[PDB]
């Protein structure tokens, strides 16, 4: 349940920054492209967010949960789902940047849990990932 989409996304985001880590491919491609477009368009916002983010082992779980709860406070939509994935990427990149790479595995798990428990119903009820591909393809 959703581990693969998260794992392939985070692997890609980290690889884009020079770090090696470790349903169908059109979905993973579309998400990569959407995320990339989003981070390019909002490059300064993302750079400043990366900067200002507070991150340690003891605070990371609460930081992720709080951000993601606020992101979806008003409901789910695809643009917010893309931001979610991109924010998971930011946290993972910063984790590695700040010599806290042990957090990557945890962040990926939190992302998969959140998809499974909190985004799955909206995605299921709004045409699934195929709809995402139709919107962004």
């Amino acid at each position: 349940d959703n581990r693969e989409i998260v794992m392939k996304y985070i692997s890609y985001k980290l690889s884009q920054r020079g770090y090696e880590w470790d349903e169908s491919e059109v979905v993973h491609q579309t998400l990569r492209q959407a995320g990339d477009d989003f981070s390019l368009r909002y490059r300064r916002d993302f750079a400043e967010m990366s900067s200002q983010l507070h991150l340690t082992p003891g605070t990371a779980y609460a930081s992720f949960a709080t951000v993601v709860e606020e992101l979806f406070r008003d409901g789910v939509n695809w643009g917010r789902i893309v931001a979610f994935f991109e924010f998971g990427g930011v946290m993972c990149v910063e984790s590695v940047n700040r010599e806290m790479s042990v957090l990557v595995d945890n962040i990926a798990a939190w992302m998969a849990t959140y998809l499974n428990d909190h985004l799955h119903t909206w995605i299921q009820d709004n045409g699934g990932w195929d709809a995402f591909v139709e919107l962004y393809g």
Binding site: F38, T66, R80, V82
Partner: peptide
């Protein structure tokens, strides 16, 4: 407290999404 900085990041992110 530390909730507050993270809450504001989340709002920034939501607003970027909705843009």
């Amino acid at each position: 407290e530390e909730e507050q900085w993270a809450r504001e990041i989340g709002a920034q992110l939501r607003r970027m999404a909705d843009d």
